[PDB]
Design a protein around this nucleic acid. Structure first.
Ligand SMILES: [Mg+2]
Ligand SMILES: [Mg+2]
Ligand SMILES: [Mg+2]
Ligand SMILES: [Mg+2]
Ligand SMILES: [Mg+2]
Ligand SMILES: [Mg+2]
Ligand SMILES: [Mg+2]
Ligand SMILES: [Mg+2]
Ligand SMILES: [Mg+2]
Ligand SMILES: [Mg+2]
Ligand SMILES: [Mg+2]
Ligand SMILES: [Mg+2]
Ligand SMILES: [Mg+2]
Ligand SMILES: [Mg+2]
Ligand SMILES: [Mg+2]
Ligand SMILES: [Mg+2]
Ligand SMILES: [Mg+2]
Ligand SMILES: [Mg+2]
Ligand SMILES: [Mg+2]
Ligand SMILES: [Mg+2]
Ligand SMILES: [Mg+2]
Ligand SMILES: [Mg+2]
Ligand SMILES: [Mg+2]
Ligand SMILES: [Mg+2]
Ligand SMILES: [Mg+2]
Ligand SMILES: [Mg+2]
Ligand SMILES: [Mg+2]
Ligand SMILES: [Mg+2]
Ligand SMILES: [Mg+2]
Ligand SMILES: [Mg+2]
Ligand SMILES: [Mg+2]
Ligand SMILES: [Mg+2]
Ligand SMILES: [Mg+2]
Ligand SMILES: [Mg+2]
Ligand SMILES: [Mg+2]
Ligand SMILES: [Mg+2]
Lengths: 82, 129, 80, 156, 122, 205
RNA sequence: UAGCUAGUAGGUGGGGUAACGGCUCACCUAGGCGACGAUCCCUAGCUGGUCUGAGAGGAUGACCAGCCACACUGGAACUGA
RNA sequence: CCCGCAGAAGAAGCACCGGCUAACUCCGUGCCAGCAGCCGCGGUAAUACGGAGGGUGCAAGCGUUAAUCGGAAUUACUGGGCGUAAAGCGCACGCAGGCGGUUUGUUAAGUCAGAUGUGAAAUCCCCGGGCUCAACCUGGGAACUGCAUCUGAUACUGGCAA
């Protein structure tokens, strides 16, 4: 099942998430179909800290991809912000 | 046999300059005539002529400045054993641009500078310095 | 307007099949010399019309045998 | 104003009837740091006489080199006997990168920025001869344009 | 030399041969000492050089030079040998590491202690 | 990770004043400056080409109190950067926080400036910076922290900086004890007795 | 290491597979591969890359990611997308 | 991470010093003991062995061993040679192969130009951003020198015709 979720990158104690669309069976940092944004939960002020290509998200969701709950929260927060 | 006639011409130029000959002659061909035009336009030889109809003979008048040969080095690059073709971004420059490289492009034989300015690549006939 | 190859018939002994050589001209990776390389293909020719030496145009299709996966399109200069 | 460097000193022998007679040689290079560089050999029984004979010989037998802002005009190759030398211009601030014998001649001549490499025998005497020969056989845009009967920009 | 000739037979680098095959691409090797003895050197030098015959854990049997002044080694001593050959001593291509399992640091050394396994004097 | 040995020893070996002391005294009245250290100092050295390159590299390193591993990284950065490698290396060395605080005068020596920086007495852009090798940027404002402003060493250091030449590139207000690193210094702003080209070639080897 | 190969090369028909196919079988043709290195023997997981080098190259395939293979040894199927 | 307390208080070693290679004297020993990467040292003045003093190089590391590339143009495509240094078959004919005087036309295979698809992400490179700095992490780009398809050019090379 194609799903949109976060792949954890960065260093110890400083998580950086890559928002990727991928087959649900693969490893978390494993092979992914496409990269659609990034999420930074430690970003300081004046750094965006969250970027999502909403058009690609819409495209993949229209093809039937599911959405991880965390990235669903990100989409709502970004859509609320602007 | 004379497998490389263009090299023969360059060698005649080189040996004639070494021997301080006023002019040199060789059997003609349109490729040789086309290179001789490039040499004349670039000021490495004084002039050239073609003589005869059934067996045309090409004659080049060599060039000296301070009792010294204008052509210091002239070497064949692409040869029948190993052809060399360069793309537009790989066209060599000899002596950091002071000399010329004769390049045969789809629009006739010209210097490397002209071919680079025309955005073409081609076979590299020789380097002249 | 389809992808295709042209080659010469090296053998016609098999029934309904022929082997063609699709020799290509390629530069050597290291030395820079251009060298001829030959590739042999078992090709399918219904009507058993191709004789040795012919120049033929071939196209790639579904596997028709253990070693044969190309089919003849037309003979070029059938003269030998 | 002339700058001089001792490159190599060597002890030679003659093997006379009574035994070995030892004498010394010098190799020196002098230059103005602005395009004139000469080398002298110099041979004597004692090292000071040798270095002095070499310097005097080096002050004469000096040639002029068409430098370009402390850098070579174009890549050049120089070969004397068994030493082959390659020198090419480099950007400002690169330094003089070369073997010891070539280092001295290029420093003293005034080439501030050069990439150099020595192939074949690195015998100091022949390396210096080969690099000086290469530097002399290096022409400039003005002289090449004059030779070719054109202008500089027409050559660029 | 010709490109045609090279295409038919490419240039073929000579394979470098190691000088310490018994080590088998290892920094050190352990072994038991079959015989400890002293042998004479090559022509230019004159001395008694102390060497030991060592059977290594991999089957190889070699002769390893014992550096330093004085050693407490005999048959059945287990030692560590490292690469390196004592030029004027034919056949010897290894050095026993002093301060290893049973080789002991040379007594009363003050300079270059690390090479001879001597702890820092108080 | 630091040179804690005798300071004037280094100046004598290098044959020049390396500014390793405050300057209240003539260095020649403080040591035999024109003689090399040790038992064999009297001998004049006939050092070779590798010798002269090594001595120049050591001089620069001992001036700035930098160890070789860090210094080699500076060369790699300077080589990678666009422009003259030698002048880039000197710009990088000048940009160090310890050198900067010494230049504006909140410290008698680079070691004294280093202790002040190390003991959380220096702020850059209002943030206390404790790292000696911190690289300062143009328009940055380096200030002594409030609690350390009353240090008698800092006051005396300002007076000593008066006698030395004022650096052009950095503007200092002593009353506020704050300075602004206006721009990267050019080569002409730095001492002319540094032969940076020797260092560049020494790493070319 | 110079010859190797009889389901071997191809064809017709039947069966078989999710699917083309000597995948399998019967019959028929006598082919197929090889000096552009077949077959045989030794070594070996492959790649993005890593290290070195001015570059071209050379060595290499730890960590991280993609693909393959294996699961005490040999064989076999069953259940199931 | 910030603040307070106490007190320089709790915190420097390893290799090397004949030449290559930065750094030298004394004492011991006497071809012994030993050193050694190479050349070599040691036989009663040892800057080469052992200790000391002095010094040089690195530094929470410093040396030694192993292993790869470099230097090595010492497999040389870039970029070497073959009279005497290693190296021209004893000579010839000749198949496969490699190479091909000159002119015209055509073709468009090599070649060249453009476009399109792809060349996973990371890594390397450039400009930035975030950890007090750096290592590290991260945004965008360039690159991935390749392959395939399409459209054009006709000098050169190839094919075909004369
Ligand atoms: Mg040599
Ligand atoms: Mg071998
Ligand atoms: Mg450290
Ligand atoms: Mg059927
Ligand atoms: Mg069937
Ligand atoms: Mg099949
Ligand atoms: Mg295996
Ligand atoms: Mg394996
Ligand atoms: Mg190289
Ligand atoms: Mg490999
Ligand atoms: Mg593992
Ligand atoms: Mg399995
Ligand atoms: Mg097991
Ligand atoms: Mg099983
Ligand atoms: Mg199921
Ligand atoms: Mg089933
Ligand atoms: Mg010295
Ligand atoms: Mg020693
Ligand atoms: Mg003595
Ligand atoms: Mg020594
Ligand atoms: Mg000693
Ligand atoms: Mg090694
Ligand atoms: Mg090499
Ligand atoms: Mg040779
Ligand atoms: Mg002989
Ligand atoms: Mg011979
Ligand atoms: Mg003969
Ligand atoms: Mg013959
Ligand atoms: Mg022709
Ligand atoms: Mg032909
Ligand atoms: Mg084409
Ligand atoms: Mg990529
Ligand atoms: Mg930052
Ligand atoms: Mg990045
Ligand atoms: Mg044509
Ligand atoms: Mg043609």
């Amino acid at each position: 099942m194609v799903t949109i979720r976060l792949a954890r990158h960065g260093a110890k104690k400083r998580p950086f998430y890559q928002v990727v669309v991928a087959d649900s069976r693969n490893a978390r940092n494993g092979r992914f179909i496409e990269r659609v944004g990034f999420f930074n939960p430690i970003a300081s002020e004046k750094e965006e800290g969250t970027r999502l290509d909403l058009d690609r998200i819409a495209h993949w969701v229209g093809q039937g991809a599911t959405i991880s709950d965390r990235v669903a929260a990100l989409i709502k927060e970004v859509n609320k912000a602007a | 046999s004379m497998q490389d006639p263009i090299a023969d011409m360059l060698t005649r130029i080189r040996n004639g300059q070494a021997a301080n000959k006023a002019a040199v002659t060789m059997p003609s061909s349109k490729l040789k005539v086309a290179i001789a035009n490039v040499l004349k336009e670039e000021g490495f030889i004084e002039d050239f002529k073609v003589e005869g109809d059934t067996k045309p003979e090409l004659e080049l008048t060599l060039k000296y400045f301070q009792g010294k040969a204008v052509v210091e080095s002239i070497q064949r690059v692409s040869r029948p054993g190993l052809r060399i073709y360069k793309r537009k971004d790989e066209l060599p420059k000899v002596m950091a641009g002071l000399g010329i490289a004769v390049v045969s492009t789809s629009k006739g034989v010209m210097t490397d500078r002209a071919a680079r300015q025309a955005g073409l690549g081609g076979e590299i006939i020789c380097y002249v310095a | 307007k389809i992808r295709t190859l042209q080659g010469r018939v090296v053998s016609d002994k098999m029934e309904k099949s022929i082997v063609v050589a699709i020799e290509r001209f390629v530069k050597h990776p290291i030395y820079g010399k251009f060298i001829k390389r030959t590739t042999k293909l078992h090709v399918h020719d219904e009507n058993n019309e191709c004789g040795i030496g012919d120049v033929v145009e071939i196209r790639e299709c579904r596997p028709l045998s253990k070693t044969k996966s190309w089919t003849l399109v037309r003979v070029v200069e059938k003269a030998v | 104003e002339l700058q001089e460097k001792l490159i190599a000193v060597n002890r030679v022998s003659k093997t006379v009837k009574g035994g070995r007679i030892f004498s010394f040689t010098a190799l020196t290079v002098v230059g103005d740091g602005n395009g004139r560089v000469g080398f002298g050999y110099g041979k004597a029984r004692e090292v000071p006489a040798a270095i002095q004979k070499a310097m005097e010989k080096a002050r004469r037998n000096m040639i002029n080199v068409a430098l370009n802002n402390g850098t070579l005009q174009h890549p050049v190759k120089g070969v004397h006997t068994g030493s082959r030398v390659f020198m090419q211009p480099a950007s400002e601030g690169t330094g003089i990168i070369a073997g010891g014998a070539m280092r001295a001649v290029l420093e003293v001549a005034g080439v501030h920025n050069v990439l150099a490499k020595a192939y074949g025998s690195t015998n100091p005497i022949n390396v210096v001869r080969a690099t000086i020969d290469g530097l002399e056989n290096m022409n400039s845009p003005e002289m090449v344009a004059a030779k070719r009967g054109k202008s500089v920009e027409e050559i660029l | 030399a010709t490109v045609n000739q090279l295409v038919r037979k490419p240039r073929a680098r000579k394979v470098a041969k190691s000088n310490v095959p018994a080590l088998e691409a290892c920094p050190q090797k352990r072994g038991v000492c079959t015989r400890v003895y002293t042998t004479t050197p090559k022509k230019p030098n004159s001395a008694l050089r102390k060497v030991c015959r060592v059977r290594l854990t991999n089957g190889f049997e070699v002769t390893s030079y014992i550096g330093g002044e004085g050693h407490n080694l005999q048959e059945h001593s287990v030692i560590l040998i490292r690469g390196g050959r004592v030029k004027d001593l034919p056949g010897v291509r290894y050095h026993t590491v002093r301060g290893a399992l049973d080789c002991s640091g040379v007594k009363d050394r003050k300079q270059a202690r690390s090479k001879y396994g001597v702890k820092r004097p108080k | 990770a630091r040179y804690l040995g005798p300071k004037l020893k280094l100046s004598r070996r290098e044959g020049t004043d390396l500014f390793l002391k405050s300057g209240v005294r003539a260095i020649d009245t403080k040591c035999k400056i024109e003689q090399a250290p040790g038992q064999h100092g009297a001998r004049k050295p006939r050092l070779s080409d590798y010798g002269v390159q090594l001595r120049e590299k050591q001089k620069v390193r001992r001036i700035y109190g930098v160890l070789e591993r860090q210094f080699r990284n500076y060369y790699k950065e300077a080589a990678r950067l666009k422009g003259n490698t030698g002048e880039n290396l000197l710009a990088l060395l000048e940009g160090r926080l310890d050198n900067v605080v010494y230049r504006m005068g909140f410290g008698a020596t680079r070691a004294e400036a280093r202790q002040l920086v190390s003991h959380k007495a220096i702020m850059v852009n209002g943030r206390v910076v404790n790292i000696a090798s911190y690289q300062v940027s143009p328009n940055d404002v380096v200030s002594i922290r409030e609690k350390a402003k009353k240090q008698s060493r800092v006051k005396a250091a300002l007076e000593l900086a008066e006698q030395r030449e004022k650096p052009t590139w950095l503007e200092v207000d002593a009353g506020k004890m704050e300075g602004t690193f206006k721009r990267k210094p050019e080569r002409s702003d730095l001492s002319a007795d540094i032969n940076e080209h020797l260092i560049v070639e020494l790493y070319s080897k």
